[PDB]
Each structure stands twice: as C-alpha cells, then as structure tokens.
C-alpha cells in the first residue's frame, strides 16, 4: 500500500515536555518528559528530533518513527512509534544545533568544545562523540563537514561579546587556512549545498566538495538600507536564505546569483519565519499583529496575509511565549501558546481548516514526514 | 540515416506517447491498462511499459532497429507498434535486460519471468518462470542458463531483501548466498552488473560457468551514507548511485580506490548516463536545474535552470521531471506544465518546448544512425 505520514513535535514553553502529534488528524502519539523546556530541531532525513534544553545542560534525542528509503522511481516509508533515544548530549548551556547529511554539531555556550556526532550511530543507540575545541566558551555555532568543521571565533578581548568570524578546523581542532572575519557573527542556516552565517557586514557562505570546506563572504547589497541579519532560514527545494534585517524587515538572498538581495518590509514586527519545504516558491512570516504572511520568494513580496491569533505585541515583553510556524504535507501549523492550541491552515488556500488542542503553552514546533510504499 | 524517438508515459493516465526526437513531432499514442514506468532494451528495438497497479507489462516495437553486415550497420525504421506479448502477474517491478535476455520481477508473485528480446519482436510468448522463494520487492538479473536473484528476508519477506544468490532457471540455488542487507539498486555497465545494499555493492561477472558475485564494501573514507539506486555507464564502465539524496557516488569497479563523491546543489530528482558521449552523465535536481557530470573529472561541469522547482518533499509520487538523452539533445519532462523541454547537449541552451497533453512523466529514448539504400 501507499502510506502518508507526518508528525508534529511540540515543546512546551515552561514545562519540560515534548508532545508528538499526528499532523494529518491531530491525535496525540506521545508525550516525552525531559529535563528542561526545549528548543527543537529536526534532522534532514527527518528520522531524529533533537530537544535542546539550555537551562538543563542537556540535549535529548527522539526517534521520530518516520524514515524513508530512496529507491529511484519510488520511495519506501518505515513507520514506528516515536521514542526517546538513549543518546543525550551534556554540557553547560547547549545552544545552536546544526545537522546536515547525517553529520551533527551541537554547540555548548558554556563549554570550550562543541560536540560532533552522526545520526546513523545515534539511531542505533551509539554515542560516538568528537569534542572539537572552540578556544573559549562563547555564544557561537559549529557547522559539520566531512573531516572538518566550521566554527565561530570568540571575541579575543571579551568572549561574552558576539564572535568575530569563523574558521575551518579539522576534527582535532587544528585551524585550516585563514580566518574568515565577520564582525558580530550570529545567525545560521543551510540551503542545499550552501551554509550561511550572518554578521554585521554580510553573510559567510560555506560549501564543501572533495577538500576542506571553502568560506566566501557576501557583503550586504549596497542597495539595502542600514541593517544586518542575526537570524536565518534556508530554502529546501530551492536555494535561498531569508534573514531578519531589523525587527520589521526581512531580506531574501540568492547565494547562486549576483543580484543576491531583496528587502521586504513587514507591516509589524516579525515573530517567526519558516520556509515551505513542499512548495519551494513560498516561505511564511508570522508578525506581532497576529497575522501569518505568505512570502512569494521569486517575486520578492508578501503575496497575502491572514489573521491567525490575537496580537502578540512584543514591545516590552520580549521574553514571553509567542507563535511558531511549522509546515507538514499541505498544511501550515501555528502554535498559539496562550490559548493552548495549534491553528491548522490549508497551505494553498491560506485559510484555517482546523485547530488542535494541546494542554499547556505549546511553543516550539517542528514537523517531519512524507509518503512512501509499504510492501 | 539518423532516427531517434522518445516514449513518454503520463503520470496518471494509461498513455504512452511517441515523439520524433529530431523535430519534436508526435508519431503515435498507445493506450495501455495503467500508468506505466518505461524501460528500453539495450538494442532499443523494444520498449516495455511496466504497469504495477494493472498487473501487466506491455511491449512496444520502437520502430528503430539495426542489423549488420559485419561490422557496418543498417538502420531499420518502421512505425512504432504495440506487440501482442504481455507479461502478467501481481505488481510488476524491476526490469533488467542483459544481452537480449530480459528478467521481469513481480513483487506479488513467487517467480520472476525471463524471456528473450528477439522472441518478443517475433511474437513469441515463451516465458521461463524462475522461483524466487517468496514474494518480495526484489530484482532478478539474467545470465546464460542462470539468474542472480534477491533473497527475501527470512523473517517476513515484506522487509527489504537480505542479499542475492545465483540460481538455475528453475530457481535451484547454485553456490553460496551473497549477503548484502537492505539490498536495492541495480544497474549494468560493461562486463559488470551491480546491486547496492547497506554495506556496499555486489558486483556480478560471468564467463562460461555460473555468474560470480563479489562484494565491494563502501570505502571507509566515505562519509556516512548508502546507495539504494544505480545507473550504469554505457560506453565507459562505471556506476553512479545516490549517497543520500543530495549526493551521488561514482564507482569504478577496476580501481582499488573505487569511490568518488559528488555534492549536488539540491536533492536529486532523476539521473541518467549519456550513451553517445560516454564520459558524461546528467542529474536533474529539485531546484529545477539540469547538471552535467563529467565522470572523468569527477565534477559537475555545467548546470542550467530548466523547470520551476520540484521539491523532493511532499509525496513520493508527486509528478516530477525525468531526463532522457537522444542524439545531441537532452529532454526533460515538465509534468505540471504539460510539456517537454529540449536542450542542446553541448551548449545546454534550450532549443524547444514540446507540449504533450496531460502530465508527461517517465521518458526513454532510442535511436541511432546507420545506412539504408
Ligand atoms: Zn525498487
Ligand atoms: Zn521500494
Ligand atoms: Zn543564538
Ligand atoms: Zn547496408
């Protein structure tokens, strides 16, 4: 038969719980108790979910229960119950998580090393870690490559400031080549074979073929107004990045083209954004007015908006829970933490079709899934 | 005299259209029983329309065949036509032709079907049924008086097969099992046939005895990943496989360092080899680009945007482009726009868009050049 399966993973803002919900009909598949409130990341394969618990000093790992086999003209889908895996990563203040092609790099803001591992080992229940020295504890990022990593460089005068650039290291932590300076580095995302790190002058763009990774700097277009990016997302089916650019602007970046940057002005301040992995021409931004906004990436504009929640005006209460967006199959999911629900929209009509009740303050959300044959 | 033809299956309708590759003109439309995957014979004389949901494989005389004088070669050009021969059985799957021997797998049967290409064009339905122990999603490779067949999982055959073995044409085991967990992916290139699995490749060769299977493990220097789908060089001996969805591996079975990795810009939608200029292969990626692979250099040598993006997320059977090479052109189906894009294989410049009613999807090309008089 032919089976479609998608799952939501939803972290509570206050309680150390991750809920798993069937995205297609909203029923509860599992509740996992962890140590602290979590931020969530999925692997590219979708087979693992990582729950980063900064205040608890741990990263927990969940087997999503959905995995695929690439068989050319068809795909197979393997479906099992979601489960908490034995793999935990421990260290002071876990921060940015980056996974690509099964390679995993977990940053720890309070440690002098990042932890590199692999998804295939994790799924088998093996913990096989490489600790890579990052010189001094700082709020940084590590990007995993074949036999190398790219790591942020701590500010040499006060490591509590933002990092000052990035460098290639081998997996013994040995610097390779020259430092790529990028003052005020913060923000990271991948899109296809290109990884981006944002800073005050532009983006660092990283690729790897059959040698060490190569870092190039793309400065912000001179046609842009003053600003810089501190948070990034990356297209899935098409190569691009979207960054913030001040609190009510975003930029769209094409790393494959010379006419690289386009500015979109939002009517109110940005709460969250995500790309649509299924409909590659679209991304979504949620704004403080309570509206979900459809971004037409190729036209470089907001193509439509719809009210989903009451306003979450962020001026003055920057720390409180706010909506987060996920996409699964042909639906868009928006958490409404203050109402203990998730709003479900049809992606193409851009209208609400259902809502899912989730006790607590459902906050961070990621989705995995697809369809395949079952023989 | 030159003649090339394209056979194009609709994604949803039981239709196979035939187009003259040189001017784009529609030549024929064949109505079959269900939506078809398409395979061609090595000779190009026959096209096979595998209709999984319909329980049948139909056979089409392409209308282009070659016969010799020794060497030389004449090109015999006729209208394409449906042939009476049909293979029937539950859930036809993998088609493997090797040297005019054809092996058709049926996921729902306990036997695979072996036949000759010649015997099809001559109207003969002489099917040899080779027992494969239990129904499973496997593969059979035909040899002279033997076949190599996948081994079903002994627990439940519903899982992926666990290896391959040589059998006689009754299905009686010959020799020892070649274990290869999670076996899937099959292609031939020159004197070697490859099956991929989670530990590496099985490589099959044959002289005057049973075929011989050896295991080529993935090089320990490779990143984590595995291969589950393969294509084989035609005119140069190599294999190309996936290695996760946005990478391919190039495999040279004659080199001790057999594996070379290539990073794709985005995830792979389809790939084929170039049978005319054998040092090239082509990968279509979800970003809508066609990528030329220079196999000798081990690199992507050029890329061009051909379609809108077709993300590999969604459903596995959302309609997406497929590639075929004919003469000095490359053809890319664009199912959601009811058309085929034509590019010059050297310059990668688009020369034509051929509209085809429906959702043109799977595509294969046959043809060549010979004398007539
Ligand atoms: Zn298959
Ligand atoms: Zn399969
Ligand atoms: Zn941060
Ligand atoms: Zn002649």
Short mmCIF file of N, CA, C and O in Angstrom, two decimals, chain A residues 251-303:
data_model
loop_
_atom_site.label_atom_id
_atom_site.label_comp_id
_atom_site.label_asym_id
_atom_site.label_seq_id
_atom_site.Cartn_x
_atom_site.Cartn_y
_atom_site.Cartn_z
N UNK A 251 15.25 40.08 4.59
CA UNK A 251 15.92 40.07 3.30
C UNK A 251 15.89 38.66 2.74
O UNK A 251 15.96 37.66 3.47
N UNK A 252 15.77 38.59 1.42
CA UNK A 252 15.82 37.35 0.66
C UNK A 252 17.15 37.35 -0.08
O UNK A 252 17.50 38.35 -0.72
N UNK A 253 17.88 36.25 0.02
CA UNK A 253 19.24 36.17 -0.51
C UNK A 253 19.34 34.97 -1.43
O UNK A 253 19.02 33.85 -1.02
N UNK A 254 19.83 35.20 -2.65
CA UNK A 254 20.10 34.12 -3.60
C UNK A 254 21.61 33.90 -3.67
O UNK A 254 22.31 34.67 -4.33
N UNK A 255 22.15 32.86 -3.02
CA UNK A 255 23.61 32.70 -2.98
C UNK A 255 24.20 32.20 -4.29
O UNK A 255 25.43 32.17 -4.41
N UNK A 256 23.37 31.81 -5.25
CA UNK A 256 23.85 31.35 -6.54
C UNK A 256 23.92 32.46 -7.58
O UNK A 256 24.46 32.23 -8.67
N UNK A 257 23.41 33.67 -7.27
CA UNK A 257 23.28 34.74 -8.25
C UNK A 257 23.94 36.02 -7.75
O UNK A 257 24.11 36.24 -6.55
N UNK A 258 24.30 36.88 -8.71
CA UNK A 258 24.95 38.15 -8.40
C UNK A 258 23.97 39.18 -7.84
O UNK A 258 24.32 39.96 -6.95
N UNK A 259 22.74 39.21 -8.36
CA UNK A 259 21.70 40.10 -7.85
C UNK A 259 21.07 39.44 -6.62
O UNK A 259 19.95 38.94 -6.62
N UNK A 260 21.85 39.46 -5.53
CA UNK A 260 21.63 38.48 -4.48
C UNK A 260 20.53 38.86 -3.50
O UNK A 260 19.92 37.96 -2.92
N UNK A 261 20.23 40.16 -3.29
CA UNK A 261 19.44 40.58 -2.14
C UNK A 261 18.16 41.31 -2.53
O UNK A 261 18.17 42.18 -3.41
N UNK A 262 17.07 41.00 -1.82
CA UNK A 262 15.83 41.76 -1.91
C UNK A 262 15.26 41.99 -0.52
O UNK A 262 15.19 41.07 0.29
N UNK A 263 14.81 43.22 -0.27
CA UNK A 263 14.25 43.62 1.01
C UNK A 263 12.73 43.52 0.97
O UNK A 263 12.10 43.97 0.01
N UNK A 264 12.13 42.94 2.01
CA UNK A 264 10.69 43.00 2.21
C UNK A 264 10.41 43.72 3.52
O UNK A 264 10.95 43.36 4.57
N UNK A 265 9.56 44.75 3.45
CA UNK A 265 9.13 45.49 4.62
C UNK A 265 7.86 44.86 5.18
O UNK A 265 6.87 44.69 4.45
N UNK A 266 7.89 44.51 6.48
CA UNK A 266 6.71 43.94 7.11
C UNK A 266 5.87 45.04 7.73
O UNK A 266 6.41 46.05 8.20
N UNK A 267 4.55 44.87 7.77
CA UNK A 267 3.71 45.90 8.39
C UNK A 267 3.93 46.04 9.89
O UNK A 267 3.84 47.15 10.41
N UNK A 268 4.21 44.94 10.59
CA UNK A 268 4.56 44.99 12.01
C UNK A 268 5.77 44.09 12.22
O UNK A 268 6.33 43.53 11.27
N UNK A 269 6.18 43.94 13.48
CA UNK A 269 7.43 43.26 13.78
C UNK A 269 7.32 41.74 13.63
O UNK A 269 6.27 41.14 13.89
N UNK A 270 8.43 41.14 13.22
CA UNK A 270 8.50 39.71 12.97
C UNK A 270 8.54 38.92 14.27
O UNK A 270 9.31 39.24 15.19
N UNK A 271 7.71 37.88 14.35
CA UNK A 271 7.72 36.93 15.45
C UNK A 271 8.50 35.66 15.09
O UNK A 271 9.28 35.15 15.90
N UNK A 272 8.29 35.15 13.88
CA UNK A 272 8.89 33.88 13.47
C UNK A 272 8.83 33.77 11.95
O UNK A 272 8.00 34.41 11.31
N UNK A 273 9.72 32.97 11.37
CA UNK A 273 9.55 32.62 9.97
C UNK A 273 10.06 31.21 9.71
O UNK A 273 10.86 30.66 10.48
N UNK A 274 9.53 30.60 8.64
CA UNK A 274 9.93 29.27 8.20
C UNK A 274 9.74 29.20 6.69
O UNK A 274 8.95 29.94 6.11
N UNK A 275 10.45 28.26 6.05
CA UNK A 275 10.24 28.02 4.63
C UNK A 275 9.20 26.93 4.45
O UNK A 275 8.91 26.13 5.35
N UNK A 276 8.59 26.90 3.27
CA UNK A 276 7.71 25.80 2.91
C UNK A 276 8.56 24.75 2.21
O UNK A 276 9.09 25.02 1.13
N UNK A 277 8.76 23.57 2.81
CA UNK A 277 9.62 22.56 2.18
C UNK A 277 8.99 21.87 1.00
O UNK A 277 9.71 21.31 0.16
N UNK A 278 7.66 21.89 0.91
CA UNK A 278 6.93 21.21 -0.16
C UNK A 278 6.70 22.13 -1.35
O UNK A 278 6.91 21.73 -2.50
N UNK A 279 6.25 23.36 -1.10
CA UNK A 279 6.06 24.37 -2.15
C UNK A 279 7.25 25.32 -2.08
O UNK A 279 7.25 26.32 -1.36
N UNK A 280 8.28 25.02 -2.87
CA UNK A 280 9.56 25.71 -2.75
C UNK A 280 9.49 27.20 -3.04
O UNK A 280 10.39 27.93 -2.64
N UNK A 281 8.47 27.68 -3.76
CA UNK A 281 8.43 29.10 -4.06
C UNK A 281 7.97 29.95 -2.87
O UNK A 281 7.97 31.17 -2.99
N UNK A 282 7.59 29.35 -1.75
CA UNK A 282 6.96 30.08 -0.66
C UNK A 282 7.72 29.92 0.65
O UNK A 282 8.35 28.89 0.91
N UNK A 283 7.63 30.97 1.47
CA UNK A 283 8.01 30.93 2.88
C UNK A 283 6.92 31.66 3.66
O UNK A 283 6.04 32.29 3.08
N UNK A 284 6.97 31.56 4.98
CA UNK A 284 5.96 32.20 5.82
C UNK A 284 6.60 32.99 6.94
O UNK A 284 7.58 32.56 7.53
N UNK A 285 6.04 34.17 7.21
CA UNK A 285 6.46 35.01 8.33
C UNK A 285 5.24 35.27 9.19
O UNK A 285 4.17 35.61 8.68
N UNK A 286 5.39 35.10 10.50
CA UNK A 286 4.36 35.47 11.45
C UNK A 286 4.75 36.79 12.10
O UNK A 286 5.91 36.97 12.50
N UNK A 287 3.80 37.72 12.20
CA UNK A 287 4.07 39.05 12.71
C UNK A 287 3.27 39.29 13.99
O UNK A 287 2.31 38.58 14.30
N UNK A 288 3.70 40.30 14.75
CA UNK A 288 3.18 40.54 16.09
C UNK A 288 1.70 40.89 16.08
O UNK A 288 1.04 40.73 17.11
N UNK A 289 1.17 41.33 14.94
CA UNK A 289 -0.25 41.66 14.83
C UNK A 289 -1.15 40.43 14.86
O UNK A 289 -2.38 40.59 14.87
N UNK A 290 -0.59 39.23 14.90
CA UNK A 290 -1.38 38.01 14.87
C UNK A 290 -1.56 37.41 13.49
O UNK A 290 -2.31 36.45 13.36
N UNK A 291 -0.90 37.95 12.48
CA UNK A 291 -1.12 37.53 11.11
C UNK A 291 -0.01 36.61 10.62
O UNK A 291 1.17 36.77 10.96
N UNK A 292 -0.40 35.65 9.80
CA UNK A 292 0.53 34.84 9.05
C UNK A 292 0.64 35.44 7.65
O UNK A 292 -0.38 35.76 7.04
N UNK A 293 1.87 35.62 7.17
CA UNK A 293 2.10 36.27 5.88
C UNK A 293 2.82 35.31 4.94
O UNK A 293 3.83 34.71 5.31
N UNK A 294 2.27 35.16 3.75
CA UNK A 294 2.85 34.31 2.71
C UNK A 294 3.89 35.11 1.94
O UNK A 294 3.59 36.19 1.40
N UNK A 295 5.12 34.60 1.88
CA UNK A 295 6.19 35.22 1.11
C UNK A 295 6.33 34.48 -0.21
O UNK A 295 6.65 33.28 -0.23
N UNK A 296 6.14 35.20 -1.31
CA UNK A 296 6.47 34.70 -2.65
C UNK A 296 7.93 35.04 -2.90
O UNK A 296 8.27 36.20 -3.16
N UNK A 297 8.79 34.03 -2.78
CA UNK A 297 10.23 34.26 -2.76
C UNK A 297 10.73 34.74 -4.12
O UNK A 297 11.61 35.60 -4.20
N UNK A 298 10.17 34.20 -5.21
CA UNK A 298 10.62 34.62 -6.53
C UNK A 298 10.15 36.03 -6.88
O UNK A 298 10.87 36.77 -7.55
N UNK A 299 8.96 36.43 -6.44
CA UNK A 299 8.52 37.80 -6.67
C UNK A 299 9.10 38.77 -5.66
O UNK A 299 9.11 39.98 -5.92
N UNK A 300 9.60 38.28 -4.53
CA UNK A 300 10.16 39.17 -3.53
C UNK A 300 9.13 40.03 -2.83
O UNK A 300 9.38 41.22 -2.58
N UNK A 301 7.98 39.46 -2.49
CA UNK A 301 6.92 40.24 -1.87
C UNK A 301 6.04 39.34 -1.01
O UNK A 301 6.02 38.12 -1.16
N UNK A 302 5.29 39.98 -0.12
CA UNK A 302 4.21 39.33 0.61
C UNK A 302 3.02 39.21 -0.33
O UNK A 302 2.46 40.22 -0.77
N UNK A 303 2.62 37.97 -0.63
CA UNK A 303 1.52 37.77 -1.58
C UNK A 303 0.15 37.77 -0.91
O UNK A 303 -0.84 38.13 -1.55
#
